[PDB]
Amino acid sequence: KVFGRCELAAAMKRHGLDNYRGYSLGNWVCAAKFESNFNTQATNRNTDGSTDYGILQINSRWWCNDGRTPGSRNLCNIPCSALLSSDITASVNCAKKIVSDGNGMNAWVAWRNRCKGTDVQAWIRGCRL
């Protein structure tokens, strides 16, 4: 599936990511955009036998189970497949324990690159408000 910017935003807002751990919605839409480009089914293989799954490309090396990751655990107690849903529910829930894991949104490489220190509010412009 492919979310539209403002649809992803709302889904996002609805599941209370807006300002979570002090990180504005725009931060999250922006992280989404560069990470998965909104593609609910974006999957990205990393070396170290791990992979980034879903909207917010969350890693199976920890957080979610795909099986095949050698040095793994699923701190989020889910199959990596459930993090490839068309309903974000899970991704944000998982995504919530990772912002809270001592680093903030640094956890997401495309956010720290492309988004951190940016005028992230531009991502929620036109969005229903």
Swiss-Prot record:
It is found in: Secreted. SUPFAM superfamilies: Lysozyme-like. Keywords: Allergen, Antimicrobial, Bacteriolytic enzyme, Disulfide bond, Glycosidase, Hydrolase, Secreted, Signal. Substrate binds at residue 101. It catalyses: Hydrolysis of (1->4)-beta-linkages between N-acetylmuramic acid and N-acetyl-D-glucosamine residues in a peptidoglycan and between N-acetyl-D-glucosamine residues in chitodextrins. One of its GO terms (biological process) is killing of cells of another organism. InterPro entries: Glyco_hydro_22, Glyco_hydro_22_CS, Glyco_hydro_22_lys, Lysozyme-like_dom_sf. Gene3D superfamilies: 1.10.530.10. It comes from the Eukaryota. The keyword Secreted applies. Monomer. Lysozymes have primarily a bacteriolytic function; those in tissues and body fluids are associated with the monocyte-macrophage system and enhance the activity of immunoagents. Has bacteriolytic activity against M.luteus. Belongs to the glycosyl hydrolase 22 family. This is Lysozyme C.
